[PDB]
Amino acid sequence: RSHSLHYLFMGASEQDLGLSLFEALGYVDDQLFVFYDHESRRVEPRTPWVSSRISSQMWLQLSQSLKGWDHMFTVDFWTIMENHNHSKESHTLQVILGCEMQEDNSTEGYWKYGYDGQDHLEFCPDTLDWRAAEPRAWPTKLEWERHKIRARQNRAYLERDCPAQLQQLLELGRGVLDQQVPPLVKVTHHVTSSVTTLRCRALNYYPQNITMKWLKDKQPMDAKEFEPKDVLPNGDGTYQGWITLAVPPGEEQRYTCQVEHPGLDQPLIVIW
C-alpha cells in the first residue's frame, strides 16, 4: 500500500494578460485536494476533508509553493519557447511532479515537462540532470545543467519536502481519504434482431480502481472478448464504469458480470 502526492501544472502562451501562466492541481492518493486558478490567482480547496482539516499553517505553505511553482514554471516556459524560436505562436507547457511513498516508507520522486503535449524533459534525481525526450529539448537540457543549482534544488524538494508534506496530508486524511465506498453493479441489455448487447455498470463507487469482467456459464471468458472497463467520473468524487458484451440473440441469461473491488468483501457477481 503506497501513497502518493503530486501536482499538475498547465499553461498556455498566447492567452492571458499578466505574466505567470499556470494553473495547478494537487492530488494526494489520486484525490484532488487543491486548485490554483488563472483568474484571481488564488488557492481554493477541493474536497471537504481539506477545506476543514487542513490547518491555516499548512495552507499557507501550500499557497506559496503553488504560487512559487507558477512563477518558476512561467520562466521555464519562456525559456523553452525561446529555445524553439517560438513566440508569435501559441504553445503549451505542462509539468507533473510528486513523490510516491512505499509501505516501507521509501520514496520515489518525479518531475516532468511536457511541451505542446509531448514529453520534453524528465528530471533524473540520481544523476542531477535531465533527459531530453527529443532533439529540440537539448538546448534547455544543457542550459539547465550548467547552472548546477536547479538540479540540487529540485532533488531536495523531491527527496525531503514532498515526502514530508505527503505525511502531513495523510495523517490529516485518515478517515475521508481512505473511506472507500463499494459499487452498485447493474447488468442491463439492449436487444435487436442483429444481436443482443449486454451492459454491466458499476455505479457510484470510490476509489477508482475496480475490476469488471464477464462470466459465460458462470465461467471466466477471455479478456479478448470484451473491451477493458471504461471508468468515467461523476462530478462528486464518485466514479462509474461499464463493460459491454455482444451475444447471440437469445443466449442472454448465459452470461453474468463479476465485479471485484476493495470496497467489497467477496467478488460480487450480478445477473439481470
Binding site: 505542446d116 503535449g117 447493474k186
Partner: protein, 99 residues
C-alpha cells in the same frame, strides 16, 4: 501535436423516466486545452450547468467533465456539442438511453 476530443455522454444512475438523474458529457484526450462544451435538451443549450476542473493525463492530453441535474422523459432528447480547434463543425453526440 494537436488532438481531437473524445465525447462520452451518459448518466450517473441508470436512466429511469420521471426520476431526476444526472447527464454527463466527458471530453478527454484532446490537446489545446481551449475547448467549449454545451449540454443540449431537444437541441437547446441548458443553463445551470456544472463542470469539474480541467486537468490532464500522462500523455499531456486534457480532460474535462460537465454535468447537469435533470429529470429524464421519453419525449426529451439529450446531447452535448463539443467545439475544438481540431473540429470543423461542433461535433455532436446524443445520449444513448442504454448507456
Amino acid at each position: 501535436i494537436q488532438r481531437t476530443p473524445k465525447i462520452q455522454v451518459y448518466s450517473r444512475h441508470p436512466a429511469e423516466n420521471g426520476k431526476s438523474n444526472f447527464l454527463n458529457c466527458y471530453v478527454s484526450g484532446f490537446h489545446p486545452s481551449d475547448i467549449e462544451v454545451d449540454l443540449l435538451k431537444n437541441g437547446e443549450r441548458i443553463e445551470k450547468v456544472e463542470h469539474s476542473d480541467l486537468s490532464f493525463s500522462k500523455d499531456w492530453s486534457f480532460y474535462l467533465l460537465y454535468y447537469t441535474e435533470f429529470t429524464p422523459t421519453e419525449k426529451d432528447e439529450y446531447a452535448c456539442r463539443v467545439n475544438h480547434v481540431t473540429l470543423s463543425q461542433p461535433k455532436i453526440v446524443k445520449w444513448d438511453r442504454d448507456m
